[PDB]
Amino acid sequence: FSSLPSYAAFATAQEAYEQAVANGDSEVVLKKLKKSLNVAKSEFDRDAAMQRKLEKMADQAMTQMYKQARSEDKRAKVTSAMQTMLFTMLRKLDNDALNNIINNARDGCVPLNIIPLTTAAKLMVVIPDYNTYKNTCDGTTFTYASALWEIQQVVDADSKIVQLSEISMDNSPNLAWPLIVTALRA
Amino acid sequence: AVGACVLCNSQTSLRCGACIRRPFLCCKCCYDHVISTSHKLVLSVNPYVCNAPGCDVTDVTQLYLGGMSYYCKSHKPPISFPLCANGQVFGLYKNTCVGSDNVTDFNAIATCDWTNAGDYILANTCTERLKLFAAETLKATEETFKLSYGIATVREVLSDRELHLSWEVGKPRPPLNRNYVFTGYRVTKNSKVQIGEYTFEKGDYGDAVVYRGTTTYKLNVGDYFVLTSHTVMPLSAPTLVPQEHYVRITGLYPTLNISDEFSSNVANYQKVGMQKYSTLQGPPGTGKSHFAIGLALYYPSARIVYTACSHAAVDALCEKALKYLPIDKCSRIIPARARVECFDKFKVNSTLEQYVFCTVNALPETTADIVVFDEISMATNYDLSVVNARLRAKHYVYIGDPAQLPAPRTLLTKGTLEPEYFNSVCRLMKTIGPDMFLGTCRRCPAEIVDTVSALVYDNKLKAHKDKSAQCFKMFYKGVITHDVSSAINRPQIGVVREFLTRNPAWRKAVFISPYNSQNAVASKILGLPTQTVDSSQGSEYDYVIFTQTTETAHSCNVNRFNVAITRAKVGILCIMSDRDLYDKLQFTSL
Amino acid sequence: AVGACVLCNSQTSLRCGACIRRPFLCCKCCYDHVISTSHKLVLSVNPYVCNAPGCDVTDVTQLYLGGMSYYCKSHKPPISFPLCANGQVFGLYKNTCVGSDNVTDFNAIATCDWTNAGDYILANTCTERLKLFAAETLKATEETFKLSYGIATVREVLSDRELHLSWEVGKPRPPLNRNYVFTGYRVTKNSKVQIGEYTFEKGDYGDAVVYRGTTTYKLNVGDYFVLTSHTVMPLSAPTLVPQEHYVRITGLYPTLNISDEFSSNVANYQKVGMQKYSTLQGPPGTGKSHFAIGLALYYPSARIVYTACSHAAVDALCEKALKYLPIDKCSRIIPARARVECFDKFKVNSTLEQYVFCTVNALPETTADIVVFDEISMATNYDLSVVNARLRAKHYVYIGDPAQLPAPRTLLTKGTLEPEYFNSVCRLMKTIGPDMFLGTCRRCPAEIVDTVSALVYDNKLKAHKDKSAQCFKMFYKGVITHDVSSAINRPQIGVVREFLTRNPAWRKAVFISPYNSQNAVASKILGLPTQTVDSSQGSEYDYVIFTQTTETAHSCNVNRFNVAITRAKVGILCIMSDRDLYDKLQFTSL
Amino acid sequence: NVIPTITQMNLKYAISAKNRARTVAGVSICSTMTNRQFHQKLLKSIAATRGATVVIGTSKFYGGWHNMLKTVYSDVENPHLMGWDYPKCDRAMPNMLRIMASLVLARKHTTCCSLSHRFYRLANECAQVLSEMVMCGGSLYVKPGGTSSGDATTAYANSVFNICQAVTANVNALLSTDGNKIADKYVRNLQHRLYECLYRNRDVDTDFVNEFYAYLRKHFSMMILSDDAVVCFNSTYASQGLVASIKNFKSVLYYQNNVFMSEAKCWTETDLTKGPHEFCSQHTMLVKQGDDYVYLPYPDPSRILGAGCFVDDIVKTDGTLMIERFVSLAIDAYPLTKHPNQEYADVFHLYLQYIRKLHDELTGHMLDMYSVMLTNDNTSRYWEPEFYEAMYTPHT
RNA sequence: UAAUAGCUUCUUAGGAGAAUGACGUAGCAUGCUACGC
RNA sequence: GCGUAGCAUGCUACGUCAUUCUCCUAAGAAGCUA
Ligand SMILES: [Zn+2]
Ligand SMILES: [Zn+2]
Ligand SMILES: [Zn+2]
Ligand SMILES: [Zn+2]
Ligand SMILES: [Zn+2]
Ligand SMILES: [Zn+2]
Fold it and tell me: Where are the LRR repeats (chain A)?
């Protein structure tokens, strides 16, 4: 605003008008300077108003260009995270058994529901009470999915280790059911 | 995506779309560049163009922003204003963009095409951030230049050990050696794909190639060969970490009963453990490779990373280490593509091993205790930055001789790159001198060794030997045919075979030439084992025959001549053209 | 961003900018502070600067709250109202504040530069919140003092084992010792960056310093050093938790037949368990450091945190624990920089272990079953608050003897600090007496232990040895030589050397002197190991040669002389200067 | 293509009247984006239309409730209001009915999509909503079926299902009658043609479909919000068996949801002046507003008092920080003032006095932490009943 | 860890429109006066 | 009567600003319902 020469033009016109007024300039001269002051003031506000649009306009650009810049910066991070997740999950695959089962497929396509059931190397069984425990996985080894598994760990709801001997009918109330038992494929 | 200004590191989001690399530039630096250079295309988060329904204006100073878009003067709204004003370019962090006068050199760095030698020398004396950008854009220029290459395909199935070449008409051909590989492409009907990459060498006569097979998938005429171009990734790490010397060796624990073989270098070895990065230089055939294993044995319980630009040098170091170092605790890192006949003698590709060998290109991002870079002469600043980035070690050991040959530097066609500006390491070594040196030699006769020491070196070599009196240097014209991408001298071999009947000594000699075409041809009429000049530098011999084909700067290269003549031990018959070279060395006249 | 007024704990949002710590003050208390003292800058949620287009008026009584903001006399709208008026200063919670005349002491705390001795004793006899604030202010003053410290640099290096030093011309030279450490600079073009942590101690011959580095980085001549500094976070925890007396043991569980060594020490552990916190005071090497491990064995299941302020004492404590406590359930925490080489034998840096040993500065914020702090003498109230805050424990046990050398307190240069004012814990130890005491000596002969049983201790210590008649007191004038800003007594050195070849059984006695200059310069001439009194604490030697450098408040310190003499094992020769010191002890005649 | 998708089970942490845990399905964004892009035009068309059978997007304020209930009474002959309930609605949903709802919603793509595109959209909808992989506490199970309450079309699909069940009940009721006892000849002919078009005809008879739709709109006018139904059925026909009654709904639920619908959870009202007994958990009452009578919905006072006392986060406990909360609760509870039971009416006055007390205490605390009271304070209108009375006037 | 959809209340920012008021420039209509014809 | 100039009053256009209101969007906080 003040930077533009319109401010200086208005200031000098106003100064001349005041000097003429205090100097007792004639009415014809007085009107001339006042009219000159008006047009000088007219330009001063005319280019002043456009500034409001300008700095206003710039702010949205910054906010917009902040936002667009902000988004892409976040886009790369999430893309890298997703790629890392995919590759880490890949490295967990049992390539041998997976290949053996998938090659047996006539069309090379198999239902997903059997991918773990025929290749997963670790079995988790969640048991609500002692009767189901005894029915399903009594002993240090058991059978499921037409395969043999051996118990390697047993934990309670609190993620506290539990010894197999502790899982007894009389000791059942003292255990924080349900039990998560983890076994391996043999 | 925001970044840092190249020449002032200030936060910015502006890129010079005209520059090949589109490097980041701040408001002030960007204005200085656009107003200074002819580059008038600049990329913010969005390109700076006239977003009119129909219009195409790319100049930035002629662009004004209106509404939420950019236009020229003829499509702007009633509202202002210029994008390029107030000594700044409109963008992010407008109030933290510091300008620098370094734009003067930045303009030359960006605008040059690397045709002349001045670019390289000025591309090496610039600051670190400009150094990285210059290296990146130079490599990009190299790759783009490689995109203009001659493509070929196999004529038909001729031999299992050798194919034939059918190139396109109107395009050049590349040099044929291990460095240059090519990719077969399978566009038959039917799904252009890859089956394997081949390396080619000139055939026997006319048109033919003796090749190297990567994949056993044999190809019909449905495929054709290209020079396997690729892209270039950006770099962040410095060419050389700051030189910070040490008081007493840290992280490197000396050994017990190291050896009697190389106890003379113990001081050097501790000095190798002293500087953060150490620079050792030794003339052709002086055990710097031997020095590497010596250092490795000096610190037994430290993880050591061997690095070299090419497969040949790293493979030689691997073999020597297998010979001396324990063989079990080794891990040679192999590229997944395997575009070369790889080295599989250790327990290969174990990145979590003590003694890990790798090439510059295939280094995975890891950490170590000490890393030894070898053959820095052929190494480029890009390689230096890459090794600085991917690898972090407590100690660095750059071993190499700038008196050797340079990197290919194909784009350089006018001017000669002197040793001082091969790269940052070579400049350092030619500036303050190598941190270490070993000047003992045991191979060449007395007159030759003395004269060679007199040519370029400062008279510090002597042979613990007497001249075998079988070293010669003649003046044979050897009329030149050179009707192939490299020069040939067959009648020179005729003049030689006029000899070789009165001198039964070197009847098991190795032929060497400064042109690979003569190297290929000389093995055809006579079955002399062949070894080009590059394939030397690491082996010693007693009967070698070297022949000079042309007369030019490439022929008078004292480095090439030195590496050529220092490989024989008792006998070498030479074909030589220039009296200038003839008056520096003493030989029998015959 | 509100807080509580320090000396009345009323809700407030006003802080004194002129105060270094910028503490929270209420309207009344802030008014009293500013009106009397030079402090005339107050910080509310907004600073109280006059917000004129251009004006700088910070005095509160000079300002008015007018319109929306604070303005000066000639910059305020006609609607004004004084800020500092009606016996108050405008601030949040204006009509809910209350203060007292105790500000008088707070005024002294704010004004004092911590140069006179009265400053500390007043700072250590104030209210609890005043105590905390005084500690914060003293630490801030110490930190700010470093800003005016001089800059060193390296002249050259003739020997890598000993640096050659150069102080900046026109600035004071800080003393060379372990307490002070340096970080470097390479400001040339080219790396105005740190080059590692080093330390210094003067060399005997000429100008030279035998140095040591946390890192290994050697210095180019351009590289130089400056004393390190670290910012300070305000402390909040009280110096000591209030004491609560329980009826029985809660939360701790005894042992079954702890051992035959700690059998007399059982009621002590009982008293420790009964009380919330406890204090143990006794002469050096009387079972104090052994007491903590005995307690640990007495309460095995209890998680225990051993803490010290220094690194040498905690290392010996860790050694003792290794000697007795199980190696498995132990840890050692070192700062990230690890300035000094600490105890590396356990699973290092494992905070979650049952028994954890650490220095105060590098303590992590965790809990425990009991925290045992050793050697209160070297620690300040700031350290007390830090330990009270970071480590949360059921029981707190403090060990240390007031008669031992106190914390550095470098700013202190006038008057003497008595043991009861070293810190709050020492104040409790001296005021009402320690909660526990033990005294007995097992190391030095009967004579010098008999003397120290009267020097500082009131006939408390019996001993177990026989006076070997090798206790010697020597009286010589010992002309002074104020050489390195620490006195050097060359003629006393002459007496020492002249009756060291006359004493065959004293060819290895460790030379001891309060001043480091004489201590070092004696090395090149009599060759015996050299050890200053300050770092001599915690080390025992077969034979000792003490030398009173000069008569003054530093060398004639009863505590310093005690800790010097109490390091001998079978005998000691000492050089006395003051007649009273030579007489109060009872040695041989000479 | 088909994109199978994982959906999480989230425990709903919200105030409730029964201890049974409430769960919602968080559907993966990959399915939500496509479902929105495929359905949102129709969904917004429904939500932005007034006077239809599906009342979604119709505000209950500004006399919206009265307009809604007057639309229900679409000139039925002998009105009787009635409402049913679906036990385990979202979990007993048969797969076929969910597929039917998806197809009905997809029928509008007669031009924007070819046949295969519609079929694959339906397949994706089923694979992502109907029978997908469900994550429950970090474990992937298979959902046997039933609608998940998280997809883009959750309320609208259930609305379509509800309309389907109602029309099925009407069809079964009309068929199961004897036939010789229907005195009205028109209805006998309608039943005959209905059976013909059901079990003796394979292409749609649009004429008869329109006739039956007009019949239902004339004697079984409906209001549906995704599972809440209010019907204004003719009682004479229902007694004669010519339109669905409660027992017909019970049978229909029995053999097409595998659930039993106890009559205790369905309500019948023989007097319209009392309005529906319950709808969207809002009781209804007729009160004299201005100079005419209008319907007002009021909630169960226990719910409002509970929302006043118990809050789901600690910071909401301060109260002074949350005046808008109590303003909204008072807006919801305003109609209780007109209830004849005084203890009902006292809830609104409690909320008003409480809002006034928070305003006073907030001003006190504000004047304590400073010394100037806020110049602009329009809060005085929030403890005057007129501001709330305006929310239930049809002017806006 | 915290779903889809709808309705409503409140606060802030932006744009547009409208109404009223004020000031300035310009255009046009009328009235009075000074000079020339 | 005509032309130029000046002053007064009135209407229209444009520009600037103040207040009030309506809507359109965006952001945030909160409640209710399925
Ligand atoms: Zn450019
Ligand atoms: Zn810049
Ligand atoms: Zn344009
Ligand atoms: Zn102060
Ligand atoms: Zn106070
Ligand atoms: Zn002022």
Answer: 30-57
* Structure token pair of residue D320: 């002074």
Identify which of C228, C229, C219 has the alpha carbon closest to the alpha carbon of residue C165: C219
What does the alpha-carbon distance between residue C513 and residue C520 come to, in Å, rounded to a whole number? Answer: 9
Instruction: Using alpha carbons only, give the angle D270, D276, D279 rounded to the nearest 5 degrees.
Output: 150
DSSP state of C104: H
Chain C contact set for D371 (CB, 8 A)? 90, 94-95
- D391: nearest nucleotide, CA–C1' criterion: E8
Structure token digits, residue A118: 């025929």
* Residues in B touching C191 (Cβ below 8 Å): 242
Q: Tell me if C120 sits within 8 A of C421, measured CB to CB.
A: yes
Torsion (CA) D338, D343, D347, D353 in degrees, nearest 10: 100
Q: Would you call A38 helix, strand, or coil by DSSP?
A: helix
Domain span including residue A126: 98-185
User: In the numeric block, which tokens belong to residue D313?
Assistant: 């986060």
Contact C296, C326 (CB under 8 A): no
- Cα C336 from Cα D263, distance rounded (Å): 74
D292 is an active site residue: no
Experimental structure resolution, Å: 3.6
Sheet holding B277-281, edge to edge: B330-332, B355-359, B304-308, B370-374, B395-399, B277-281, B436-437
* Distance from C-alpha of B486 to C-alpha of C229, rounded to nearest angstrom: 67
Distance CA C412, CA C116 (A): 6
Q: What is the DSSP letter of A176?
A: -
C285: left (phi over 0), alpha (psi -120 to 50) or beta: left
- For C172-202, the DSSP string reads --PPPSSS-EEEEE--SSS--S---EEE--B
Bridge partners of C209, per DSSP, are C163, C202
For residue C216, what are its two tokens? 């290994």
Contacts of C90 in chain D (CB under 8 A): 371
Give the Å distance between the CA of B21 and the centre of ligand 3.
Answer: 27
* 3-state secondary structure (DSSP) of residue D180: coil
Neighbors of chain B by Cβ distance (3+ pairs < 8 Å): A, C
Tokens of D260: 């039993």
Indicate the helix (H) or strand (E) that contains B107: helix B103-111
Give the separation between CA A11 and CA B130, rounded to whole angstroms. 50
Residues 338..377 of D with a Cβ closer than 8 Å to C: which?
A: 368-371
DSSP string of D336-372, one letter each residue: GGGSSSHHHHHHHHHHHHHHHHHHHHHHHHHHHHSS-
- Count Cβ atoms below 10 Å from residue A116 Cβ, excluding itself: 14
On whether the CB atoms of residues C400 and C377 are closer than 8 A, the answer is yes
List strand E contacts in D 42-71 (CB < 7 A).
43-44, 47-48, 56-61
Note whether D152 and D35 are within 8 A (CB). yes
Chains that touch C (3 or more CB pairs under 8 A): B, D
The enclosing domain of A156 has a CATH number of: 3.30.70.3540
Handedness of CA C64, C67, C70, C74 (dihedral sign): negative
Known binder of ligand: residue B150? no
Q: How was this structure determined?
A: cryo-EM
Cα gap D123→D34, rounded to integer Å: 13
**How far is B556 from B564, CA to CA, in rounded Å?**
12
User: Angle at which helices B446-455 and B558-565 pack, to 10 degrees?
Assistant: 160
Q: Strand E: which positions are within 7 A of a protein CB?
A: 1-11, 14-15, 24-26
CB-based contact (8 Å) between C64 and chain D? no
Residue D227 annotated to the active site: yes
Order of strands, sheet of A179-185, starting from the edge strand that comes earlier in the sequence: A122-127, A179-185, A147-155, A141-144
Q: State the Cα–Cα distance between residues C97 and C90, nearest whole angstrom.
A: 11
Amino acid, single-letter form, for residue A82: M
The pair of three-digit structure tokens given for residue B429, joined into one six-digit string? 């070594």
